[PDB]
Ligand binder design. Sequence first.
Ligand SMILES: [Zn+2]
Ligand SMILES: [Zn+2]
Ligand SMILES: [Zn+2]
Lengths: 224, 60, 37, 128, 136
Amino acid sequence: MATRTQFENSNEIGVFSKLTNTYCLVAVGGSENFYSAFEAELGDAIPIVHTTIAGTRIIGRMTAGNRRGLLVPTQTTDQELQHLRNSLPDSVKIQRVEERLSALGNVICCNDYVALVHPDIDRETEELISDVLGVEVFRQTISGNILVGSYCSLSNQGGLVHPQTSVQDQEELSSLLQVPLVAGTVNRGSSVVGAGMVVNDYLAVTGLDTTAPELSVIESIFRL
Amino acid sequence: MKVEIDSFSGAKIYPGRGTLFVRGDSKIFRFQNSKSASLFKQRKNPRRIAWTVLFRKHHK
Amino acid sequence: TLLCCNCGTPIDGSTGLVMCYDCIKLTVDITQGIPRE
Amino acid sequence: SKVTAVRCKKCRTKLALSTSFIAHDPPSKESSEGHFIKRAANSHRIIDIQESQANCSHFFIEPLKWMQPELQGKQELEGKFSCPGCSSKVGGYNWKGSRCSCGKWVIPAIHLQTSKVDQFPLQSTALP
Amino acid sequence: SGNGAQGTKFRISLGLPVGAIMNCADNSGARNLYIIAVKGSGSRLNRLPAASLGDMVMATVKKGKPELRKKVMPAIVVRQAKSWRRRDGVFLYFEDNAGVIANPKGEMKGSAITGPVGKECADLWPRVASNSGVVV
RNA sequence: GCGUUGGAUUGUUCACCCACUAAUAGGGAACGUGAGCUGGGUUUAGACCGUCGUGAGACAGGUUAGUUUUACCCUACUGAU
Ligand SMILES: [Zn+2]
Ligand SMILES: [Zn+2]
Ligand SMILES: [Zn+2]
């Protein structure tokens, strides 16, 4: 359901975590409240893996994973990929990408069926995405903002975009993603909605200073 | 631990030796020493620089 | 097609904006730190 | 109007329902009710002249079946309470004060905050 | 120094002192930023203060979009050209010094950071990580 | 005990803003310190203006140019036999 937390004192939960339908990744920053905001509302259907990729605690901006695969950038090492492989269900495939745009969670906005991709991605990348995730792509900007994975949080049930999204563009996004959206905000008005919060098909974690009208329109559309 | 390669010459860069250089077109270069780094700065071509791996592979 | 997120009700445009006009009127100040006499 | 239900923030548990929240007429404002009176050490002297706020920042409810074991075990005059499924505080109990956020002395009753506390309609959403 | 910053940074080599005119990396409308001061800098006589990667500075726009210039605004240094040492042994440097206009809380003013961004800058601020395509 | 800044203008001490900072406290040692430096100011001789004087000339008014010397001795201090 709806959950607030903070990583250390920041409300950008999607920066420090990557939640999906099969697993959930978090960073190592203490904060038993931040860990319990997952593991208190989670059964053991999904494993909560603690990892840093390329030494960075910003793992939710540099991984772009699905329910059936995980994309780590070229900067990750062998040891923190082995730690991912030895603690994750084998229905996914941890493929390390080698292309230019290193912030994969920033340039990729994917759920279990469709993937919205930043336009200047390499032509070798989207076919690899459709190989490891079984998912077709759409190389279109949310609203001129070419960073589609941080200005749009997306699940199978609903979507959510930043409030500069034109009404003519929400139609195109809903027709290509086959999913209704809403132009909303998060964390007292932060327009970086794909990074201010993380989502599942049954759990939506939000930053701590979010408001009740923000959580109402998050939980209204992300459950259906 | 991982060993890497010089980008100009093709020498095995060991950890703690050489430099890195992140170009403005978002390409990353490794240099084993200041000779290879300065030959990259002077716009030289590793296919012309005779002692690299590229010269020996192009000249077979 | 948004909501205020402070009071919640009014749908505002996509021209580049914030919470509602009464919300920036009553909650947000930009004239603080002056003596009125 | 329709019925509502008040619940907690950062945790998803239903706290209380409607058919509560007496409005109790917040403003009178003659000389001393709208002023947060702080009496000094002697002579009934009043230093602090603070105007009361306009918004009502507290919920006033009835004793609850979840409140019955806490009221039955180790009863004292004034304390604090919280959610059983969490540890985030929602307020305190008293039968001699803890007036309002607007600040009138009332009958002995349990209060509820609206900071880290929200309210939701019991029926479905309006779906905008 | 900790003005909205996430954690604690190691000592990067001080790349660019006051008076340095670095580029502007985001689409705020500015084009260059003139560094006038560094937040959280120690005072020694005659030592004029210098900014490394990931530092929050106070700066001034010198070119572009006249709504932005002639005022002091906080910036965050996202690229530097002085070669610094990462603790895993690599020395590295970018080809230009470049910063990003932010508020005092650390939240950016633009929407996309063109060009690469150092790891030591992207990690220390969660808003610079959210707006940067290439990291290192 | 330990610290007490970076600048814009001015020869300035003084003052005044800008900005960072834990903080930008007040003073003294021949109003510390020119065989330590600099020479912007003042303070020779050149010249221009304004006022005053019949005039030569005056101005603590404005402006611009204008040589800054010596240690190898004794002590002191720093190191070395
Ligand atoms: Zn409003
Ligand atoms: Zn609770
Ligand atoms: Zn009241």
